[PDB]
Amino acid sequence: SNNIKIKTLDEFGRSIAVGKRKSSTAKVFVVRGTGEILVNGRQLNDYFLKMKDRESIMYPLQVIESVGKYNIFATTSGGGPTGQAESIMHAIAKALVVFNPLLKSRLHKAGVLTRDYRHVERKK
Amino acid sequence: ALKSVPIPPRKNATLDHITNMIMRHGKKEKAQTILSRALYLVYCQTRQDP
């Protein structure tokens, strides 16, 4: 038989997904809201100083034009600012598919559902 | 509603190319700051889109 069980929102209406980039990992909680984001309990502008990192986090929501329709509670650890910001980006994209599985094709086409494989390679 | 909306562009190709040419040693943030500050000064003297 198959090993895939339909993903569904939890008891509090939250979609939980994990993402990885380089050495970083991110676990995000997406719920329907008004665009409030918290990264490790801190404001987005506090945790991520680079605007390009903030723009990466927003991109999946910008693809489905739902930037003001969800509250994101992102928790990230490991690597640096870029790995964490893009790991959160990847995790938000995977968590948005539960709210509307018809938008998976658009998320895949934008490239936010593809796990970036590049990592530091020991010189050979 | 989304079927007829083009996927928004991840980045500007020209600005990204200019930024990487300015950048050295992987210090992209400094390169982006220099370009953004320069383009901010162009807007403040021409009052057009830099």
Added chain:
Amino acid sequence: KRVTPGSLYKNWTNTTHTAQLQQTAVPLALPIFNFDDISKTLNKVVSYSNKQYKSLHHLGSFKKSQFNELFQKPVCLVREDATNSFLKKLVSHPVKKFIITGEPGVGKTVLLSQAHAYAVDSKQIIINISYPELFLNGRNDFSYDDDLKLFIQPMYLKKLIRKILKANDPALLKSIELSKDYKFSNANPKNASVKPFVTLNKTKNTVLDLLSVMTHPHNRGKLMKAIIDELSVQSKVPIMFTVDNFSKVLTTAYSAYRNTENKQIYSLDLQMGKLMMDIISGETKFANGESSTILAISGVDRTNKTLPVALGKIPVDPYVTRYHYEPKFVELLQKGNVTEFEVPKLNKQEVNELIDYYKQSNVLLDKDITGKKWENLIDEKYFLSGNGNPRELLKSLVLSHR
């Protein structure tokens, strides 16, 4: 020379501040700031009045790195949760001693500028210390006064006294007749060699005359003590004493100045430090009951346990080293009953108003106006600004070319 009369030779932050780049901005007609009619300007972008702009420029209310050059003159959003809330407490609270806090770039300086604008309208005398670092960095002269037992800073005091004279209405200053007779040494280059001293008799001369006394650098500390005493004894005019970037004072207990034993001088051994903390602690009491003391912190300064403990946000930890905890400042702040007012972040509706003003000012890029729905822009800029930070909002709009 390599530098021509109009060449932009400074760095970017100073060029934007000093290069007069607002000249090309488009004149817009905005309502005027008036707290007595806030109902008509609440949640709307307003310019200041002509009388307020003149006073606030002389006080140093507007600072560099505030994107003021984008607009013809500096503008402010009259907010309900920040501007209206704070100004109502200032008019009602009996103590009227506040310290404005909040995350870096949240708008603490703009709030203080709106309190200065209110004071100008409400016929008050404003004493502002915009950049306390100037009397703590050791870049101006200092001298020890035996009669005051304090280190006076003549160069700094000369600038401060002129700011108090040029920023405040002469009529208010003239109304305050002097309570004591004062004698100073004459430094006026016209009659200095004819008149050894200049006398200010009581009930005849005013505080306006006192602020125009040209004295020698060694007697300028005694002139600052007279001005403060005269303003603290009179009950006619309320005195609003303000200090921006007060976090610098709390975190720099020892100035860069060194005494004759090569020992750094404690900040409370300077007249500026002693005077500032005497007004905050309550040692210097003002007769008028509408006098206030509004302090504001800045995110450019380091943080430590001093301010949080003084505000009651954390318990006192006695084993914290003095470099991260100054118990003397905590005692002074708690003796003055200073209360905290945290500036809240912007809500999405306030972001909408600011972005609608920016569109009319022609400061928005073409990628945010053409092919983008207005609702999408507001949602995106509210997300990219950290859910309300005004400074991150402006940067996302005018300083993000990626």
Added chain:
Amino acid sequence: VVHILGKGFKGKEVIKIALASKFYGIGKTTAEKICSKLGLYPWMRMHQLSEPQIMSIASELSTMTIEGDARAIVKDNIALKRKIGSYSGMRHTLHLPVRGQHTRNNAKTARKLNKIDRR
């Protein structure tokens, strides 16, 4: 130009930095103590000094071991090494490194400067 004990200084030069730059034997720490002792504020510049203050600097500088006196102490310590016949003294005489440096390569600065009558 401000002249202190013969040395000439450009007006804009910071006093604490200028003193440690033109006077042999005075470094950053020593210069700061002189300025602190004379009541000069940390970032005061030479053009600001008055003639009474220029004389005060010369007085404090004349009560220290600087210039010839300081240079003589080094020349006399080096001469003592040669007089006692220590290995280090011979290195100074031969214009060779005196602190264990290899000589198969490099050793160019020791060749130009190592000498009994060291500058």
Added chain:
RNA sequence: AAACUCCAUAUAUAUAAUUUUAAUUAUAUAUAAUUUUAUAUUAUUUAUUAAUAUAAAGAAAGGAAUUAAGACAAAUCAUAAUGAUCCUUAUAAUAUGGGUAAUAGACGUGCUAUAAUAAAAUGAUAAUAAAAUUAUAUAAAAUAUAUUUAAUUAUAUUUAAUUAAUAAUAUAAAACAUUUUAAUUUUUAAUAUAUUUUUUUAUUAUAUAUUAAUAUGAAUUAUAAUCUGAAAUUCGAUUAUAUGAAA
């Protein structure tokens, strides 16, 4: 041979009484791709086709190992081992000290630097890592001195915890913000001035030399102190004050 593999990656199951906590993890087992399908175009050996694009599905994009033959009679008798030949009161063995660190020139490989798209300070409810190490140990916090309120840095005193998913080495750093920065009169100061006030403008003073070495650079050298060791002279490391070369 290639593949079949192993690693990485994605997913599933199992394990943890979720205080050895990182469950955003650990590591056992299993699955997955050497991707697949549809359509148009251009070529073809024109058909059940390749090159292309377009659409759809997908996390899927990278690596290692994987053996046969020959040559240079290429390196190694100094990792150890073998034959021949030579030494056997010495070409074997031990101790003390010295040398391998010498210095004309030359060569290879590195480090640091020659300033403003770049260096220096400061950033305590402490921005953000990974992989390793600790019974022939890793050493916390505190205190004392350099040394100044304190911090920082170095060492001493003392020796908490941990022989470890537990405690320690160890608050990563750059980043980012503020301040500062010679050449540079592009500065600073004294007056006056301003609706640029951390700032503008005006008038005076602010040097001379100068193709040049500064508040760049840190070689060389003096003195004092410290660390390891039984021992730091030839010939070790660190710190402070002073010295400040070439570039």
